[model samples]
Target: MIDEPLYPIAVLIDELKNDDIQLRLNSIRRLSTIARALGEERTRKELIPFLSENNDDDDEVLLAMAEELGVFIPYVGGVEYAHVLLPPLETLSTVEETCVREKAVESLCRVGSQMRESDLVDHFISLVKRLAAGEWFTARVSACGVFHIAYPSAPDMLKTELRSLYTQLCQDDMPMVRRAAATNLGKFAATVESAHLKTDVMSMFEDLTQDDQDSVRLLAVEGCAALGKLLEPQDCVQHILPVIVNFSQDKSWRVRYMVANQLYELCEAVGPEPTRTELVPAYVRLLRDNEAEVRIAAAGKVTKFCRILNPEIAIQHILPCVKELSSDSSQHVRSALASVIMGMAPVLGKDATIEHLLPIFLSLLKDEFPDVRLNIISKL
Candidate 1:
């Protein structure tokens, strides 16, 4: 550890102001190392002055500052000093280079939540707009994080404005912005009262699930998984279930794969009966997904069930799905079923295993593909 005595922050500070880009870049890295070793508290005084002075260097030096600024904003500066960083942070967050700009708001997001009424100013609204509708979609993605950061502590008026902007971002023309919006929607679900979750947030998620891009829909479904903990059963079934079922049968195979990943959390939120009635059917439907990779992904989730679910429910739902999977056209699907079959013995027990599993196992021994027979033999 280079304590303050071992490192010369003063010399580095002067070198950082040098006209030569090489000296400035090297000085920035050294200062970053010194501040980290000295701890954010000791270097707290150092970063703010340079950060408040965080410009006038060339793009290279400014880029270096942008990266280092995020490290100190929420960590070094006391929580209330958020307002101090905003000035230089504003320039960096919108600058053309990706890292130089993106890192700016990413830092502010963590800083934003801790800010006080005294620390905050109207400058936030314009920055939010610039990042939200900026030419660079990457800034818009990072901007999504700010919604959670500000909404938690902002007064109702600010909250309303943030809500409107977030909804617009979700519906933006760029898939990247919508992708970020879908991913972070659940955090808002946790932050705001359920009223917003039911109305704006949930509505945002539903529209994203129906979005044309599979990339966007995957995140929308993942967001649904996170919302599971926040939503009540009746609300989940009435609102969430329809979207989930729609995507479970979506034409895109990757979309089906995401639904398989989300099934357990969906099961937990809606409780056993709704899970059995709604999620179970939707999941079973994944077995017939068009791509072998999608079918393989869905089948892999079967072994995960015995731990979260009942033996009866497992047999009732799982038995049918795996049986259909056993005769699947792809040897990979049959082999995946073979890999997890022995795991079912404990859950299904002797009688149920003999009736449901052994027949599938015995038939696979003569599988036309030697790979299927070999996997069955290894697991036996």
Candidate 2:
């Protein structure tokens, strides 16, 4: 039965009808492979009837049916076939089996993409609401991805649903769900127009900043930066600056480094002086941080501050940190100090940087790390 010249389609269909569950399962798998190769028209004409007939009773068969039907939908042509293809997917969406339901939603998304059916938007919104409110974390995450694709085409229709979904997702008991929600919120903020919608989205991010999970908090921080870029600096500084400053002192070096990069962009928004006065203390503390990378990042931010804001303020804010870091034990830190100082020389003036800052840099010029020595010499 497995090896036949013709490999009769009837024999294949009979395998799907086997009383033994494994045989039936194997037959469904092979039928799916055949459907994929035989072209959608013949597959639909010949196999879809058998698969769809048994799909409601067998979860495995339902999944296979959904897969094959989804593959067939794009080529089915005309409105009549779309009508036929959609109901099985809609039925699978309501399946009791989680795996079946998950695949069904995915296939629905693919079908939705091809058909551009507005009704699928509503279907997704309803499913996402259920998933967002459901206990299953993967369901919620999958729902988020589904809505991400559906939201753009008809955002206004989805506005209220999306807002509520984000609010619930933001507070989800699972960190994974909350992180996915936070990411979705970032995407939503870019697409939606309502002020209340924007506020809701931003508030979700704000709440996420205090999330118990460190990675969640980091995602929240990155989201904050993304939202910050969209709004005016004043708008961002109000909410985002505190998060940046707080994370700048995070125990995790990665968090500190991310906050440093964020602060650099926020500095451009808030201008050098206010950022210096408001944020420099955090950078100063980080400059002497246990991690050399943190210090190096801080060094780069200091130079950026000098170039953008008052050089006098930059000198005052940056020089002290540079002084502390110039003698850093790590070669990377010392090298970063030289590069930052040299980069700031024109802004801070050669006389001041060399006279006041050069000595500290010079101490490392003859240091052990050849790369450090070379960087120092090149900068000098």
Candidate 3:
């Protein structure tokens, strides 16, 4: 009894195929224990292969398996053998469920990052090629996320091929694949050679920003701040600024909401000069946007946005918006603004707070919404 392996492979194999879904999930969750008991050789040789073949199951179980493999570097005989973990994740990445494929791609990235440069060239890059060319769009979607991980280590020839493959994904026939490409574009650009940042990455950004599908464009909006940080300030002003201004008034409110959420991220990237001249007007438009949801998002960032501005800018521009929003028709909008408004007091200093903010506070303190009144009192 004392000599019995604590979590033998046979028992794990049984639990993996168990009828009860929870049992399979639990077994997958405890996979490292079985890997430990089986020893590194079998974990790499037998266990990893078994997982690759056993991937057709509940998404929750598959999610657990994907997560477990991401952290399985040590269990699979260290970084040298990390490539062995990719096969199971590659299989999981093509599954129909969104969450499962997402986790699988995430794990594939983790494993690919730990691999030796040669191993990445030989094994991981081949996996990327296969996924990008898969018949079902799901594999192609997963292909988008792994490019950044593999690009930094690939040989020059293969690096060119990776860039080409990523560009094809960005213009893929399937909108789902294009959305994934747009989603990962920022991270992928970070790993790209500087020579290509303006020419290749910029063209891709322009195309994605103009993608016909609103879903794809909304995701493209998210890449602005990330790509902004990579470009020189003038490049940001010349390239990213115009796109941001265009997006702030996009036809879809959801896209406008994303602009509201992401606008503050560009403040430091574009510098105070543009923030005051360019982004400030864009922000003011969002604050007065037709949609209350957009207002709520912009309102939440008021104090952070103000921190990037001088007192004069905050008071001259932002304070008026605050007074109007304090009496906003939507209680939720008022509540969102109320939570962050007090923090702006320090940013605006003693006099501005007393002169401008005092009436707003008094009015909010007696507001009709209980949550709004509560938020003001708590902040005080």
Candidate 4:
């Protein structure tokens, strides 16, 4: 360690404000070092405030600042002064750059989680409210991400307001804001009480599922699994199942692709009976989807989907799809099937493996794509 560290922070102050972007970036990267030399109080009083005001710079510098501030609770005199770190992060959250705002939200969540609950209601909730209600879509988008952290600590009165604010963001005029709300809805739902989950969260989920933007609808697909895991099976069947079935055949291939990726997650929530009657048919449709990318995703989850089914159903329903997937026109689909297809042997038993899987194994072993052949061989 250097004998004297005081000079480093002075240089950091100058470099952080330097006209050269690279020089400012270097200073932002060295933030913890400067904070250490200045000690926590001065870091809270001076360094953090300076960073708060010097926000009109490069996205690279802002991203570094956003990331550095997340781990900065220890440097800002622990939890007591943690709120001081929020202003700079709040500024970063409003920036035009997506990555910068994302980092800022992540750091704000970190800082918000560490504060005293009373302080969180006062400081963190206030910050979230500003971002949630900000005129710019960027701040509103950032607002959606922090609710899960804030909701749990807020008072009943504030929690109700927080939930209402979230509903507004979910139904915001901007598709980008709704997309952010859709992406974070599951996390927010996880923190809400069950009574409100059925009403408040589920209502938002249903609306997002019907959103005109496919981008918003696809993320609602992701939320289905997350929210499903939290709700009762009956609730999933009533609320989530219809939306999932609709999304599995959504007009956008990307939306169908998300359904392909997320469908297996509902197996536990909806149980074995629905798995056979409802989801298996959905899986089969996806396996035969016109889109190659959707098939690749659905093909990759073959073993997982089969694990939830009875061996007979796996043989009758999934094996046929597995066979088709093995010879899929898309090499990527064939390769994806090859990677998970071998695991089905134990699920189906010896006679079934020999009669059903053996021929498929041989067929994939000779697949034109090296990746398809290699993937099957490694899994074997």
Model 3: which ten-residue window has the lowest total lDDT?
Answer: 1-10
Q: Write the per-residue lDDT of candidate 2 for residues 262-323, one digit (tens) a residue.
A: 76677776666567678777767777677877777877666776677676776776677777
lDDT, candidate 4, 1-380, per-residue tens: 56465776788778888889998989888888888888888988888888888688878888998999999988888898888988999999999788999999999989888888878988999998999999999999999999988899889999999989999998999999999999999999999999899999988998898888878888888888899999999889989988888888877898888888878998889999988888989899999999999999999998998987899898898888988887789999999999999888888889989999999999999988899999989865
**Clashes per model (N, Cα, C within 3 A):** 0, 0, 0, 0
lDDT scores in order: 0.74, 0.68, 0.89, 0.89
Residue 186 of model 4 has an lDDT of 94
TM-score of 4: 0.89
lDDT of 1 by residue, 282-359 (tens): 877886677888788777767765546777888887788888898888889888767776677777789888888888
Better of 2 and 3 by TM-score: 3
Model 1 TM-score, 2 decimals: 0.76
TM for candidate 3 is 0.85
Q: Select the stronger candidate by lDDT from 1 and 4.
A: 4
Error of 1 at 129 (Å): 5.7
Model 2 RMSD in angstroms: 5.8
Candidate 1, superposed: residue stretches over 4 Å from native? 1-21, 32-63, 73-77, 95-100, 113-130, 133-139, 173-175, 212-214, 306-317, 324-339, 360-380
Best by TM-score: 4
